[PDB]
Each structure stands twice: as C-alpha cells, then as structure tokens.
Amino acid sequence: QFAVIGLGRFGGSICKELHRMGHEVLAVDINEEKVNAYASYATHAVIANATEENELLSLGIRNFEYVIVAIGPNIQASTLTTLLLKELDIPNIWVKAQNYYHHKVLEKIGADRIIHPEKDMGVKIAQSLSDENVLNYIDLSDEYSIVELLATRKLDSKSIIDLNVRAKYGCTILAIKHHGDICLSPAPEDIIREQDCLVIMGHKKDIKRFENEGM
Amino acid sequence: QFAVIGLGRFGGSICKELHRMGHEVLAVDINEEKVNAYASYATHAVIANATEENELLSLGIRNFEYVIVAIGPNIQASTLTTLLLKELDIPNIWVKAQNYYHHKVLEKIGADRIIHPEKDMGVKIAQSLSDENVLNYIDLSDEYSIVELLATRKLDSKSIIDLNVRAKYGCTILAIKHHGDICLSPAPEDIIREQDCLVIMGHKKDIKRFENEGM
Amino acid sequence: QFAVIGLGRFGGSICKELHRMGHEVLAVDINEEKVNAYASYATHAVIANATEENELLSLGIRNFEYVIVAIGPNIQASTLTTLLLKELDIPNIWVKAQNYYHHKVLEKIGADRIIHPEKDMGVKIAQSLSDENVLNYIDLSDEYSIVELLATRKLDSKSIIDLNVRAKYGCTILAIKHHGDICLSPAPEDIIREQDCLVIMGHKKDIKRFENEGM
Amino acid sequence: QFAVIGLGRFGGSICKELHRMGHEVLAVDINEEKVNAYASYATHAVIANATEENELLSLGIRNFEYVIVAIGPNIQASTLTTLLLKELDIPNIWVKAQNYYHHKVLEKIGADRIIHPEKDMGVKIAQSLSDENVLNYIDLSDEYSIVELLATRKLDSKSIIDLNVRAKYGCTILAIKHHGDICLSPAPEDIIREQDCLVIMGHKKDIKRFENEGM
Amino acid sequence: QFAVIGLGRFGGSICKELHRMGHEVLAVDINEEKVNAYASYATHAVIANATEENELLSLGIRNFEYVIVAIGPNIQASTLTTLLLKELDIPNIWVKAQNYYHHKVLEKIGADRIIHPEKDMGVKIAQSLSDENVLNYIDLSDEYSIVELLATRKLDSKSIIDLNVRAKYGCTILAIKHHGDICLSPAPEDIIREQDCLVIMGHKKDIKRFENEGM
Amino acid sequence: QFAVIGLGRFGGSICKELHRMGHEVLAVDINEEKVNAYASYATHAVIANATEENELLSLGIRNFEYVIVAIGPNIQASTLTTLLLKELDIPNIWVKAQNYYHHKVLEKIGADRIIHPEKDMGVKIAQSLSDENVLNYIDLSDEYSIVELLATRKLDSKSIIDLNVRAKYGCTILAIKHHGDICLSPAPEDIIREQDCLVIMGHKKDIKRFENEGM
Amino acid sequence: QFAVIGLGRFGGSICKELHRMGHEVLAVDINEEKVNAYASYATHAVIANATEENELLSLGIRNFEYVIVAIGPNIQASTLTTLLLKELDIPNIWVKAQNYYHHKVLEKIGADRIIHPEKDMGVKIAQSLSDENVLNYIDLSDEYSIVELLATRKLDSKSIIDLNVRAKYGCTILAIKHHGDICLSPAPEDIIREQDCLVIMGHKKDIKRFENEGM
Amino acid sequence: QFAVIGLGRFGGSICKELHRMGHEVLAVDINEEKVNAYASYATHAVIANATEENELLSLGIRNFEYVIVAIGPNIQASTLTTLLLKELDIPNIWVKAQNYYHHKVLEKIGADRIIHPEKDMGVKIAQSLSDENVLNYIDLSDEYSIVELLATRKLDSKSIIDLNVRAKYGCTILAIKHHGDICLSPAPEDIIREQDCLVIMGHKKDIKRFENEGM
Ligand SMILES: Nc1ncnc2c1ncn2[C@@H]1O[C@H](COP(=O)(O)OP(=O)(O)O)[C@@H](O)[C@H]1O
Ligand SMILES: Nc1ncnc2c1ncn2[C@@H]1O[C@H](COP(=O)(O)OP(=O)(O)O)[C@@H](O)[C@H]1O
Ligand SMILES: Nc1ncnc2c1ncn2[C@@H]1O[C@H](COP(=O)(O)OP(=O)(O)O)[C@@H](O)[C@H]1O
Ligand SMILES: Nc1ncnc2c1ncn2[C@@H]1O[C@H](COP(=O)(O)OP(=O)(O)O)[C@@H](O)[C@H]1O
Ligand SMILES: Nc1ncnc2c1ncn2[C@@H]1O[C@H](COP(=O)(O)OP(=O)(O)O)[C@@H](O)[C@H]1O
Ligand SMILES: Nc1ncnc2c1ncn2[C@@H]1O[C@H](COP(=O)(O)OP(=O)(O)O)[C@@H](O)[C@H]1O
Ligand SMILES: Nc1ncnc2c1ncn2[C@@H]1O[C@H](COP(=O)(O)OP(=O)(O)O)[C@@H](O)[C@H]1O
Ligand SMILES: Nc1ncnc2c1ncn2[C@@H]1O[C@H](COP(=O)(O)OP(=O)(O)O)[C@@H](O)[C@H]1O
C-alpha cells in the first residue's frame, strides 16, 4: 500500500512510523546498510538503484497506491525517480523538495504533493518559541486556532470558573493534563496546577490576550 | 533575542519565519552566499565559523536568550558549537539532530531542546498519509489528540446530534469550517456538509473508530 | 556561442556543420574517443559528464547562448542535462526527443525546442519516395509548398507556355536546371527537357494534379 | 509496393507516414510489441527475423519494389539483411547508416540509397541555427537558393515595393504567411507584418545581405 | 608471401609465429606503437589504415598471396578491409570473425577462410576439461580420431603387449614420449612409464573405453 | 562439475561444447541477454557479478570441480574473480589471459591453467599457412609430429607400397579418408586418390621432404 | 587492568599486542565474530553494545584503570561510550579520533588521550616518502631529533672519523646495523657499508645538511 | 612527484603533510567534497574513480614516481587500483592494507610497500602504557631500541654518573629535556630532575630492567 524509496532522515522516519501504525510498507534503498537497518521496520526491504526503471518494475512499484520519493542530497535522483514513477501511472507521488527550483520542477513533472519538512517544522518551532507557554498547536483558519499551553505560576491553584475565558476572552478550555493524567472537557470546578498542559480554543489575538493577563 | 547559527533548509526557515513574525533575529553562517541571501530576512547577518570560540564572542552570542544550532550535514559544527555555547552559559540552546546519536550527545552536553525535524515531520506526513481525511492535528499526549478532518459524502447533510460522537465514540466535535466560514463549538442542530473541515477531539483509537464506521 | 553536448550521429553532425559554417563551437562528450575524433571539427573539445552540474560549471556552459543536448540512448541523461541547463539560465536549450514521453517531459522542464530527427527525415523521405519525381521540397504551410521535380519523357521538349501551370493548376514554375546549367524565373519561351530539374510552386494538391496528368 | 523492415524511431516513422499518405506498406519486425503497435499504421504487420532468408521468402519480399532496411543499433541485422535482399534481386534497397563504415559496405554490397538521417537533419537544423529567422529552405544549386524567413520588427508594416529586393539585392519574394493565412506571389502593395513567414528567392550571399541590412 | 593487417592478440601471434618459422611477413597496423613493437618480429612493418584503398595500394598488397585481416574490436575495419582486398583480387583472404554475423557477411563478400578462434579453442578446451588425460588430439572423422594422453599410475611400468589395445579395444598405439625422448611406432616390448605421452589411434568410444578400464 | 563464468566468444563456446558433449555446466554472466541466450546451451544459467563474493557463494561455486574464468575487456574482474575462487579452495581454476602481465599476475595468484587462445590458434593457423596442404595436425614433440594432408594429383591413383614413406622418408602413413569413408592403418595394397585425407606420421623435416618430392 | 572496547584494525591490534606483552586485557565488541576471533588474543572476550550503560556495568568496566575506545564506522559509539565512561569515573579513557571534530568533542567531554593513528602514521610515512633514505625517526623537540637513515653509495666503506658529524655538522651517530648485526655507540674506527642502517642524532636542519653534502 | 589516490583519514593526512613539507602533490578522490576540502592542501585536486583505467590515464598518473593507494572500506577497489597502477609501470606503489588477506594479495600483485597504520600505533600505545614514562620510542632492530622517558621521583636530582647505565645496564643516555630546554649528549656531571625528558638508548630488555629497578 505504501512505498518509501529513500530511507534517510526523512523517508526512514516515514517508513518506521507507517510500519508502527500497522500499515504494510515496502522500503527501498540503494545503500545496503540502510536496507538492512530498516528490515525490522518494514514489511519488505529492497536494495535497488532507483535511477533504473527496470529495477522499479522488478520492485513491483505499480502495485502501490502511494510511493514516497525521499532523496535529499541528490536533486537529479529525486526528479528523475519522480519522473519514472509518473511514467508508471502511480496514483500519488509525494516528493521532498530541496529548494525553490526543486519545488518548481517537481511541480511541473506532476508531483502529487511537495513537502518542505524543515520549513513546516520551522514555523512550528517559531510559533512554539515566540511565546514560551505554547507547547503545541493547530490552526483552524487564518484567525482561529486551538492551542496547547504550559501552565505558569499565575495559573496555579486556579479554577476554570475563576478563569472565565468563555466570556472575558471568548475562548474555551478543552483539556487539562496533570502529571501525565488527562482530563477532557473539564468541568468548571476543576483545578489547574502549574506546569500542567492547558488546551484552549479560540481566536489568536484573544488567546494572546488571555496569555498576557491570565498567565 | 534570537540567534540562528545555521542558515540552511532548516535554520534559514526558522530565521525567515521569525523575521516575518516581527522578532529580531541575528543570522550566522560560514557560507557568504547564505549570509547574503538572508540579509533581507534578518535583523543582522554575519559570516562566522560556529566552531571558533573567539568568533562566537565577536558575535556577542551571550546577548541572546535563544540560540538555534541548525547545522545538518556536518555533526561537527553542531555538537562543537552546542558545547561552546553551553560553556558561554546560553539560557536556551535548541539543536537539530541528525540521528539517535546526535540526540544522545546533545542530551548529555546540556541541550535544552533537541529537534528531529525529519522525524517529527515524518510521523506527521505518516498520519496525514494513513488517512487522506486528516488535514492537520495536535497530540495532547501519547493517547489523546485533536484531529482536523475533510468531510466526505458519508458525512454530507448530517447533524451533530445525528453523529453522536460524545457518547458512541467518546470524542467531541470542536469546529466546522464551511466554504471558508467558520463555526466554533457548534450546537447539535448544526449541519455538516461534505468537503468541509471537521475538528474532532479525543482518543486516537476512538477517532480512528469514528473514521472507520462513521465516514 | 554554440555548445554541443552529445557527439553522436546527430549532435556530432551539428557540431561539424556549425564548425564548417565558420561558427565557434564547444563540443562535449563523456566518451574520450568521440572527443578526440571531433577535436578537428570544433573550436574546443572536452570530456565531461553532462549529468554532473559542477562539470557543466567547469565547462563555462553559462557563457554560451545556444546549448544542444544530443544524447540518444539514455533518456535519463537527456532530461537530466536539459534540467541542469535550465537551472543555469541557458537562453536556448535544444534537445533530441526519443519518443512521445521524452517530448512531453522535455516540454514541461522548459526545453526551447524539441527535435524529432527520425520523424522529420521520415516525412521528408516519405514525400521523396512516394513520388519518383520529387528530388527535394520545402513546405511553406500545411497546404502550400515549393517542389523540385525530375522531368520525365512526358515533359521532354515542352515549353512553359505549353504547360500552362499558372492557369491550369494555379501553380508557378520558378527554376529549370539543365545539365547543371541553371535558369531562374524562366520566360514562357523556355524549353524543358527530360531528366532536368523543375521547380514548381503552389498548392500541394494542385502540384499532385499536375504530376498526375502532366508528367 | 513498400516494405519497412525495421519499425523503430526512423523506420517506424517512414511506415506510419507512408500509410498516412495512402500507400500500401508491409511492416516487418523482430519484436512482437512493435509489430502490434504498427498494426494500425500499416496494411500488414509481421514478426520476422530479417537476418533469416527463409523468413524473408515467407514474407514474399520479392513482391515489393521498395524495401527499407531500418535497423539502427545492430549493424549485423542491417548489412546482413541488405545482403540477403540484394541476393533476392530487390529493385530498390534503402538502408539507414550508422557511420562511415556502414555507408561503405552498404555502398559496396549494392545498396540503392544509403541514408544518414541524423547527419542531414543535423545540417538542416544547423542552417536553421546559424540564423534564428530561417524556418526552412531549399538549395537550387551551390550558389542559389529559396529561403523561408521569420519577419522581425524591422520588417513590420513594411510593403514589398518599400523593400525593393528585386533591384537592391537581386532577390525575389515568393510568398507571405500571416496568421496562418497565405499569400502566393504577392503584389507590391501587400504589407508584411512581423512574426510572419517571408519566402525569398535568389543568391545566398544576396539573401544574407538583405537579412543583414534589411532585417 | 604473407601479410598481417591487424597486429593484436590474434594477428600479432600469427605474424610472430610465421616470422619464427622462417617465412617473410609484412605487418600492417594503424597504431604506431604496435608497428614499432613488431618491427623485430616481421620482415617489414608499416603504419597504415586498412580501410583506405590508396594506402593499401601504397603497401603493395597485391604482391601478396596471403593477406590476413585480424581486427577484433572493430567490425568496421575488418569487413571494409576484407571488401577492399576482394576488390584487389587477393588470392587468399583470411579474416577473424567476431560473431555469427561477421562470419555471414565475410562469407558473402568472398572471404577465403573465416576463423572463430575462441569457438574452436572452445571445443578444444571443452574436450580438455571433459577428460583429465588428453593433452592434444586430431579428429580423422566424426567417429575416428588420434589422441595424445598423459600416462597415469595405472600405466606405469606397463608394456605394449601387456596393454593389448589392438585386439581388446581395437585401437593402436603410435608413439611414446618419455622425458622428452621420443619413440615412434614402438615395438610390443617397449615400456610405458607414468607422466609420459601416449599416442593412441582409433574409434572415439573405444579410446574412451580404454581410458575408462585401462587408466 | 563445470562452471563457466564468462559467456563471451570464448567462455560461451566452452559452455556450449561442454553441454554438447553431455556434461552438466552452470553458466554465469553479469549480462542478462547472455544468460538468456545460453539457457538452452547449459544445465543452468545465472546472472551474477563474478567480482562479488556473496554472489559466488549464492551460486554454490564450491560445488564445482572446474570453474572457468574468461574475461576479455576487464583484467581487474578476471584477477579478482580468480582471487575469490582461490579463496574458496576451487580445485581447478582456468583463466583466459589478455597479455604477458595478466599471465604473470594470474600465475602468482594461483591460476591452475592459463590460456592464450589467440596465440595457440595463431600458431596453428601459421602452420596451416606454411603448408597449403595441411588440414590438421598434432605435435608429439619439438621435432616429431602427426600430420593430416589433402592429397594432390601427384598422389592420385598411387599405392602405399608405391609411396614407400617408411623407408625413403622414415615417416609412416596412418589413415586414409576416401569420399568421407575412412581407412585406419591401411595395408600397402591400398590406393590413394586425390582430394583425399592422408594421415602421415614422423619427423617434421622428413614430412616436409615427402611433401616436396612426393606431392 | 586494560579493556579494549572496539576490536577492529586499531583496537584489535592494541588488544593482541597488550596480550602478547603479558598484560591482562578484556576485549569488548558488539560483533560476535570479532569477539570469537579475539578469544585467544585476550584474557576475556565479551559481546556488548558500548552505547548501552547497563551492559558496561555488566562488564565491570569500573574495575579497569585503562579503557580504550576504538570504534571506527560511526562517531556515535565512540563519543557516546567515552561519555558513559567519563560518567563512571574511569581513570584513563583513550579514544581513536576520526577527524578534527572527534578530537574536539572528545577533548571537551574529558578524554584523557585522543589518538589520530592515521594522522601520525601518515606524517611518518610522508617523511619516509619525502626522503627515501630516512627509514624512521623520533622527535625530541621542535628542533632536535634522532633519525634512522638508509646508507647510500656515498657512505660505502666510510669510517666514522672520516664522516666527522660530531664537529662538522654537530650531530652524533648512535648505531650501525649491518646485515642484521648491530653496533651500538660505535667507535670512530668502525666502518659503514652501504644499504646499512645509520642512526644519527641532532638538529633537524643539521641532519638535513649532512644528508645533503654527505650522502 | 607524489600522487594520493585516497583522501581519507590516512591518505588525506599524507597529502596534507607532503604538501606542508613543500612537495608538489596531486590529490585524487571519487568524492567531490573530499577533493574540494583538500584543494588548499595540494598542488592539484581531481575527482576521479581510481578503478577506471582511462581516468587514471587522464590524470597523467604515469608522470608520478610515487602513487599512494589509500582506500579503506573497499578491498576490491584497493587491489584493482594497485593492479592498474602496476600495469602502468608506476615505480613505487604504496597501499594501505585492511587485513592479512589484503596484505597477501597486494603482496602478490606487486605492491612496493604495504602499510598497517593502526597495528603500529597499537603496539606503540602498548609500549607507552605499561610505563607512563615511555612517551615514544624507536626500534633499531628486533632486540635493540631507543626510548624516550618521563622522569619519575626516583630519578629527581640524580646525576648521570650516579645512574651508571652504561655499565650496570649496558644502555646509554642520549639527551635531557628540562623545561623545554634541551641538552644533547650530556656530560656525567649533568643533573636529571623529575618529570623531565630522558632519552635512553640500548637493549629493550635492559632498558626495561633500568625502568624496573632505577625509575
Ligand atoms: N540514487 C539513489 N537511489 C536510491 N536511493 C538513494 C539514491 N541517492 C540517495 N538515496 C537514499 O536517500 C537517502 C537520503 O537521506 P537524507 O540525505 O537523510 O535525506 P532526508 O534528509 O530527506 O532524509 C539515503 O539514505 C540514501 O540511501
Ligand atoms: N562551523 C560552522 N560555522 C558556521 N556555520 C556553519 C558551520 N558549518 C556549517 N555551517 C552552515 O550551516 C548550514 C547548514 O545548512 P544545511 O546543510 O541546509 O542544514 P539543514 O539541511 O539542516 O537545513 C550551511 O549553510 C553552512 O554554511
Ligand atoms: N551522460 C553523458 N554525458 C555526456 N555525453 C554523453 C552522456 N551520455 C551519452 N553521451 C554521448 O552522447 C552520444 C550519443 O550519440 P547517439 O546515441 O549516436 O545519439 P544520436 O543518434 O542522436 O546521434 C554518445 O557519443 C555519448 O558519448
Ligand atoms: N534482425 C532484425 N529483424 C527485424 N527487425 C529488427 C532486427 N533487429 C532489430 N530490429 C528492429 O529494428 C528496430 C530498431 O529501432 P531503433 O534501435 O530505434 O533504430 P533507430 O534508432 O535507427 O530508429 C527495433 O524496434 C527492432 O524491433
Ligand atoms: N583500420 C585498421 N587498420 C590497421 N590496423 C588496425 C585497424 N583497426 C585496428 N587495428 C589494429 O588491430 C589491433 C586489434 O587487436 P585486438 O583488439 O587485440 O584483436 P584480437 O583480440 O583479435 O587480437 C589493434 O592493435 C590495432 O592496432
Ligand atoms: N565483472 C564481471 N562479472 C561477471 N561477468 C562479466 C564481468 N565483466 C564482464 N563479464 C562478462 O564477460 C563477457 C565478456 O566476454 P568476451 O569479451 O567476449 O570474452 P572472449 O573474447 O574471451 O569471449 C561479457 O559477456 C560479460 O557479460
Ligand atoms: N556499539 C558498539 N559496541 C561495541 N563494539 C562496536 C560498536 N560499534 C562497532 N563496534 C566494533 O568496533 C570495530 C570497529 O572496527 P573498524 O571499523 O576497523 O574501526 P577502525 O577502522 O577505527 O579500526 C568493529 O569490529 C565493531 O565490531
Ligand atoms: N573507488 C574509489 N575511487 C577513488 N576514491 C575512492 C574510491 N572509494 C573510496 N575512495 C576514497 O577513499 C577515502 C576512504 O578513506 P577512509 O575510509 O577514511 O580510509 P582511511 O580511514 O584508511 O583513510 C574516501 O575519502 C573516498 O573518497
């Protein structure tokens, strides 16, 4: 169902995680050591030169609905492999881009999805660092978002009804994680202790306001 | 306030994004072309070898609360710089890891946060790939998460009270995005049309169950 | 001014002819024997892998306004070379296509002109053999053309005013070549002897008619 | 009437085009897929080894006036087949040459015409390259020729009587192609717009002069 | 009397051996180093392209009764030269064949003898591996042959009258070579010691029988 | 029992002939086309790189008593393969040599037999040329040999007792092949007709004498 | 007393030699074949992952005064192990360095001695190549050294009092090795024959002078 | 004058040092990063596969008197390179060996010197560790050596005439290094302070005795 062509920092992780989720994955790599190392982290693992189409045919690459092209240092191999896969009518081809150029040519040669892993992780890191409180988040839209927060001393021993976010800031608390224990959709009587995870939901500026005055 | 030591695919993105957000960032790089290219995407841009202590002193690296070590292909510059920075009492040192090892030695030499961009983006892509429906998500913990979904035909013209997720699956719907318009914490009378964004919250396996039988 | 990347049956001819015309041409080839053989048929001759970018940089390939990619047996090397050249902002990139696919991908990766030598030669030869008389020709458009013909016995000792092509077929005679001697824009009194070259100009179907009934 | 022995890039084109012109063609090929692919582009299509005499006899190869030997990568099949055909008293044997040698031995073993498709296409393209404007041409002799030109801005909105080529350069304009529309033997009042096709006729050097000072 | 056109692994050996036997040989080669190296192993040695007729005339190739064409890597030079030699009415033309094809076209263009050295050496080596004992042999017919054998322990100190091959196996012993000393048509009293050469003559199967039970 | 590692002009013939004799042979070749072509001419045929040890182990090369290493274009692969086989304690390793050097290094790395096909065939052809008559022969020693001759008119209708070779020249007639029919150890009354095969045995110079005066 | 953690080209030799000298050594390796191979060349041999702390504790690694970290293929095992050992208060940790980096991080994480085997052996061999005569040497300081020299013809049959190095060049001869026989601190009457070992001692530039004018 | 084929831990150091000494060195490497990194540490630096003969010819490798083969991970490439160099009549070929086997085969294919760097460093460390005083040493022969020592407290304020090594142990003191200052061939009145460098010369076992009872 899934094929990973490059078993490196990026593709190897995709393979390992897909395998961990319970899906069947065929891992490909030109380097024998990589193939051997991911033998336990994949349904099948094969040594093959991705630059030769007949080898791809030998892999039975057409039997897959999703083929992942994760070759980083070599743009040549990346775009060429993507091309060969595009020849074989692969339904979905996802390729890692190195730069603007790579993104462009992959875009033109019919890549289904082009990923800039470092960049996207970068915006995650940037938002996570800009305000020390947010551990993680998800953007529902340009204006609205759900935010995971690290409780400070200002929130210690404070109740949900005490911190009336639903009216004063128009945001809503979703979950509280305390010492690994978790509380989903907590009742107003619940207490928030410091260093705990607080899951708020609402408008970005409003969340920023609550962060400002509340914590 | 923030310093980016490696201006590559990863660090360059962090610098550019931080600059876009309005924060002041000092970009460092041993390659002159990189420094020149990021002159417009940073408050200041300097050519310097991060492995040389006197150069670090010349940068005024101690004046920063956050220093990001993002050097990928060469572990040398990364761990050595991290070490030198740990000597200079940098409050927060965030470093990009290449493998299990890099993570280990960074962990022991006092790295405040170790990032595996390819790995985490890898698992994100993996989750996004396992189900085409999930557009984005956030993990509250090892077991609990909030998931953004792309509504299918099975969910078309269905009401929230019709899809009783709060009891049948123990999950809760948070938001519905329809043609760009957005509905936060929607009432049970609200209708979900296909191709819309559906924000569910709960246990991973339970959300998967709802995905299986519901949509 | 001109660069030939593949010194084979096709590209080698381009190089040799361009050199014969008096233009300065840099010939490239991965095969040393080929490079040696075309040393006398080029301003400069270099051994280089067209698939390696730095080698292209070493060639000073950017200093050329026209670079010809003539690699036949390997589609990989062809599209790859075209790609690398497209990176280096080469003004005009002309590439040999092997098949429909090759034409497509070259088209998408920004090839300025795509040549099917076999095909065009095929149609030229097809028109040349279909009619025993046609020695050569040029197509002005999809419908109109100028045709060179070999005079038969039916045309022997016939005058231009006798063979009134300007009215009977709407075509015009341009030149008559007799025993090597040549007559341009001949007067109606001129005589056409057999085995001579006759240059007619007009519509294809009309020329075919004149061929059918006249000669 | 016509037989094509090699259905490749070259011979396949000859077969397809000949079939398109309305002539009856028998296509031969050692490869079954090729034979199948040209079933629709030929009167008949047969699987046969051109190096085997009895197979040639089985084809009824003697019933043809023109047999085309187009086998490229393998000189063996080409010269051997040509030889067998010369034995069977084939009226016209046309063979594709790979190099100087192939031309030589085909010449000696009684080939009626030896074709270097890449070479001639090469010189055609070469003349097309020396001047960007010339789209096509025909040489009447060593000194005289008819040339098709691409009108530049210098020729825009210019009349034929304005560009007095018949006296100033001794050349004559034959046709003007404007937006696909075509004008044969145009009157001096006619206007030439840029990017149009201009058909001049005369001496090579004179045409070059007109190209130089005029456009 | 003898001319060697290709001074390689094959032709060079022929030249050297013919020269060693006392015959006068003219060695030809396009490579100067070869010509220099075979100067001492030939009556005369000349640098010449065997594909050029005027050079062949300059060699005085017609003055030779035997001309050997030994060019391996290039089928071109071989068949073309053979052709030119056939034009010049050379009495005997012997050419080395590369494959079935080379044999075919040489056969048709009037080669006096076509040699497949590797192949015939192949059957000799095949017999040499098939039987541990035979040092050399000659086939009189499809069924009858003369065989040279290496004496084993089973033949040590055995007399000819002891090994009655003329009646028991119907074969006849011809010669015995002992420590370089040689005995032709030996008398029945003669002794055969091990590691000596034994020359038997008769039917193949019978010789095999004698090998089986005797030695 | 027998393994052929290089399926070319030399090794392929060894394989084919060994197979023809009825022995079981495993053919190896890195080129798939070669392996396919010799599938019918071998017990088993495998695609394998002879320079790779694990592949050799996969072949079960140790199960063979005779392994033939025949490499023409690449001396490296030859000596390396011979080396690996010598490591695996192969009883008999026979290798084709390209030159003196190759012979030396093969000699030192423990090659069991080194064959120069061109050389030996060269001297055989040389003796075949020295005398137009000799069809075949075998050398018993440096001075003594058995020779096969093509009878001329001088020997026509001559009896063995008429041509007293046993006394006048000290050589002995062994066999006469007459119209394909064969006579072994013929009686003195037997007649020799021209164009028949005559098998003489004796001293080289004496045989030459008999050729001189007799035929 | 001594523990060798990596049994490769470097560490294996250390273990074998230390064992040969009579010291007790515990050899460690993650590879079972290596551990088995060095069972006879060590007091004890154990299979263990040097990156796993509990395994190190199981080894009783604290009971050793000297632990050698020689792991080649990856910096990971080396620095991580060195780190763990520095944690466990190992008295002496000597580690093989891969590059400048490895040296740096080992230096900072408290490595007692960092070895560049290739670097030092490389510069020694380099000295052996720059001057063919010097077989070996040792540097007492930046300026002074003892050098072993290979006697040339210029030194043949020369006496020590003849070559007054102690006064003319300020260097002193220490030993003369002749045909394996050795003379320590030789008297001025002793003779030096060519191809013998000559042990000089003094200033580098002075030794170079003596080499220049003397030999 | 010197060529380095492998720019790794070993060969790279040789190149750098040879360049540092003032000699001209041509550095070769199949990896571009290595070639670029050693551009400043060599007269010339080239990307080339050492296993390809024509590339070696292109390098002008024959123009060198010394060619160093330093390729570690691939024994194949090593021996093949050594082989090709042996073909080109290179005067001196020095190769790094990986193991006993490699040493053997390099020995047989005509390697001029075979180096095991790690082994020698291993034995050096082995001698250096039993007694901390030995910093370094040199073996004059199997039995005799010169040793550099670190003076202990037992040697503090002791005179040369006090420590009569020339008679009691048969060894001779050569030099004393005190605070960086150096004394060559010191007089018996000279004093040795602890932790100073003491250069002894004599028999290995005797030196060991002196170390045991004396220091
Ligand atoms: N030509 C090729 N064919 C097949 N696989 C390749 C080729 N080139 C590189 N790879 C594989 O791609 C991987 C690249 O990994 P890496 O450089 O870490 O990229 P990323 O950072 O995207 O993971 C390597 O593990 C390598 O085995
Ligand atoms: N010692 C050093 N000092 C300063 N900058 C360095 C040093 N080593 C590497 N760099 C810089 O770090 C950058 C690494 O970027 P890149 O390889 O793209 O990392 P990633 O792939 O993680 O984005 C390079 O542009 C380089 O200039
Ligand atoms: N990667 C490459 N880099 C440079 N030159 C190449 C490469 N691959 C092939 N070539 C050259 O291209 C030529 C191919 O010529 P050929 O196959 O005859 O094409 P055509 O039939 O169009 O002339 C060869 O001579 C070869 O040397
Ligand atoms: N012996 C043969 N008999 C018949 N057809 C052949 C023989 N050998 C080759 N062919 C055909 O000739 C074609 C060669 O085409 P190709 O190599 O593309 O030539 P070119 O490059 O000149 O177009 C192949 O499709 C093959 O099927
Ligand atoms: N056109 C030619 N004219 C003369 N000599 C030639 C020509 N072409 C090749 N040769 C010679 O033939 C030799 C080929 O030898 P080789 O390849 O070893 O053949 P073989 O393996 O049959 O001995 C080369 O040394 C070359 O000098
Ligand atoms: N490294 C290798 N491993 C295995 N087979 C090889 C290798 N290199 C070449 N070969 C095979 O050897 C054959 C070469 O045969 P050829 O050059 O005809 O030798 P000969 O002239 O002795 O017949 C090729 O068909 C090729 O498949
Ligand atoms: N994590 C580990 N724990 C223990 N031993 C290891 C580990 N990783 C590698 N080794 C051993 O270290 C040895 C390294 O040898 P080698 O690669 O030759 O290094 P070098 O070239 O520095 O001598 C290998 O034999 C391997 O068995
Ligand atoms: N086939 C090859 N041709 C040329 N250079 C090579 C080849 N294979 C490896 N190399 C080079 O040899 C070097 C190997 O060095 P390394 O593995 O560090 O050995 P060592 O540690 O003994 O120096 C690498 O830098 C690599 O670029």
Author numbering:
A (entry chain C), B (entry chain D), C (entry chain B), D (entry chain A), E (entry chain G), F (entry chain H), ...: 8 to 222
The authors write:
KtrAB is a cation channel with a nucleotide-dependent RCK domain. KtrA binds nucleotides, ATP or ADP. ATP binding induces the adoption of a square-conformation by the octameric ring and increased K+ flux activity through KtrAB; ADP binding results in a non-square conformation and decreased flux.
As a control, we also analyzed the impact of mutating A80 since substitution with a bulkier side-chain was expected to cause a distortion of the nucleotide-binding site. As expected, A80P resulted in KtrAB inactivation. The ATP-bound structures do not adopt a square conformation, displaying L1/L2 distances for A80P (at 3.9 Å resolution) of 52/23 Å and for E125Q (at 4.1 Å resolution and with two different half-rings in the asymmetric unit) of 34/30 Å and 42/27 Å. In contrast, we found a large structural variability in the non-square structures, with four different conformational groups based on Cα N38 L1/L2 distances.
